[PDB]
Amino acid sequence: GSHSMRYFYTAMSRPGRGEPRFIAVGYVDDTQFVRFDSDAASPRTEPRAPWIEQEGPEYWDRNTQIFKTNTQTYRESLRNLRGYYNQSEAGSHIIQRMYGCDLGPDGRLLRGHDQSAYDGKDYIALNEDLSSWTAADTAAQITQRKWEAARVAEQRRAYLEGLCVEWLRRYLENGKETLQRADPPKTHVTHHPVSDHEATLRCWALGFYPAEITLTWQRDGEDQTQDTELVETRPAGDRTFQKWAAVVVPSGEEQRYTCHVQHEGLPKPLTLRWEP
């Protein structure tokens, strides 16, 4: 496919410091477009992308009611899970949930998602059939039984195949100038002598969008996966991302190394080498 929409919910208990905080953020690909934080002075769904601002009052009020209701529901869920694990009321815990839809390059639903975790560990997930569940343990099995009895899978599926795809396609059109624009990475290789007979070759990729990118070093046409230091792709703050890969090589053998860059914004993969 080529596009996706995802909502990320985080509910965190904090005994002695008020009721569990609920935060929700929505993304289209690697672009965040909305947020809600129950801890805000006056909790309300807020825009985070220019193209969502055009949505009317009803849109925002509808969103706010949903997240305000979720704030209450997830607090109930945290109380339930605490019990499923026989946990004390003194500890802080977290429920996380990711859900959304993926569309193919044509605009058709590729697949749907609905995964939950408790304290950072997979808890329950809706299977790809969007009809059955996979529970991680006997506690999640209780949630599963509860959701099967209530026909929750059917409600999630209805959303994923309907509203999710409908609104995603709408967002893609409204923000086509950015959401449907891939920015290729600006690339270059730096050289850093480490000693008399070894130097570091660092391949840079800057200002690209989306975040998906492949950066690799090859020696004599052979990639150095095991010898390459690859940092995590990081956000620049202007919607674009940055990434670099480095390899320590023998002085004088620099030309036997080549950096290969693959990015959606590149018509053809790139091959770079250090240019003294």
Binding site: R62, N63, I66, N70, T73, E76, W147, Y159, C164
Partner: peptide, 10 residues
């Protein structure tokens, strides 16, 4: 747009 509420508790 997000999933309709109320959702079922865990």
């Amino acid at each position: 747009a997000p999933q309709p509420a109320p959702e079922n508790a865990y």
